[PDB]
Amino acid sequence: GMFASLVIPVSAQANSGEMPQEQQLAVKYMDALTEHDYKTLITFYNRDSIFFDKTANRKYTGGRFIIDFLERAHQGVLEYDFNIEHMYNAGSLVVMIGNYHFKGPGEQFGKPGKIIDVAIPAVTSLKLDMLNRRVTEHVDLIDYQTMSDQLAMQ
Amino acid sequence: EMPQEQQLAVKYMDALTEHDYKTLITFYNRDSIFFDKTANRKYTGGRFIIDFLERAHQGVLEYDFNIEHMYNAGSLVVMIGNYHFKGPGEQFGKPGKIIDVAIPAVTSLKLDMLNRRVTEHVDLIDYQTMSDQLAMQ
Structure with missing residues (x-):
């Protein structure tokens, strides 16, 4: 057969009637994160929320500390994408397998004065508190x- | 070319999926944790991990973890892939049948590279x- 691939924002799939509510909330969080929408993002945290990059062995506890780390880390970074290959959930634990695509000024990537383009494989999981619309733990x-x-090569 | 941490993870997964328990137990002490975080099921120590595998996979015909992408950060190894299991259906709610499933998964292993052990296996x-x-079965 002849097939094409269509790139679709996951937000446009979220209301199909088939996506679990836990996944729908994860989409809102990830869209805020990848757009650097910190006003929205901080609504998903409280003083007990954890952001753990387990690969980097960096565990931040508390929404204010997480937001400051994110804002500083992304100085000069343009909106980036999380291009997912698969998302699933077990209750309030949402698992996303995909690639993070960054394109733009390369200062944060060790490439000052250049434009970089990278696609980084990743697994991200979110443990959600559905009652309070909160991320209790984000693991990268x-x-x-x-x-x-x-x-x-750049 | 494969990092040593990845080579150990493949040796461990081959032992697990073959049920080569003599090799597998070399990776465990009584503190090694197997946590299926999606099932919220934990088993700690070689004896109890192996007992779980014997029960989970009783009568198995075929079992493999087909790795699609693997990477590591130091002694933390991450494997994205698919578990293929063919075996008796009784415990999967299908008595009298052989079921055949191919399940998307991420498995991470935290390795003790000094002692050549798996300290935490998270599924x-x-x-x-x-x-x-x-x-459909």
Whole structure:
């Protein structure tokens, strides 16, 4: 057969009638994160929320500390995409397998004065508190070596 | 070329999926944790992990973890793939049948590289896909 691939924002799939509510909430969170919408993002945290990049072995506890870390880390970074291959959930634990695509100024990537383009494999999980519309734990497993391999050519 | 941490993870997964318990037990002490975070099921220590595998996989015909992408950050190894299981259906709600499922998953291993042990094995398994497949069986 002849097939094409259509790139669709997950927000346009969220209301199909088939996506679990836990996944729908994860989409809202990830759209805020990847757009650097910190006003929205901080609504998903409280003083007990955890952001853990397990690959980097960096665990931040508390929404104010998480937001400051994110804002600083992304100085100069343009909106980025999370291109998912698969998302599933077990109750309030949502698991997303995909690639994070960054294109733009390369200062944060060790490439000052250049434009970079990288696609970084990752698994991200969110444990959600559905009553309070909160992320209690965000765990990232980022393939930094693949990112480094791509940057070596830029 | 494969990092040593990845090579150990493949040795461990091959032992697990073959049920080569003599090799597998070399990776465990009584503190090694197997956590299926999606099932919210934990087993700690080689004896109890192996007992779980014996029960979970009783009468198995075929079992493999087909790795689609693997990476590591130090002694943390991450494997994205699919578990293929063919075996008796009784415990999957299908008595008298052999079921055949191919389940999307992420498995991460935290390795003790000094002692050549798995300190934490965390599974994130897509059980809803498994259920969708079983519904056709």
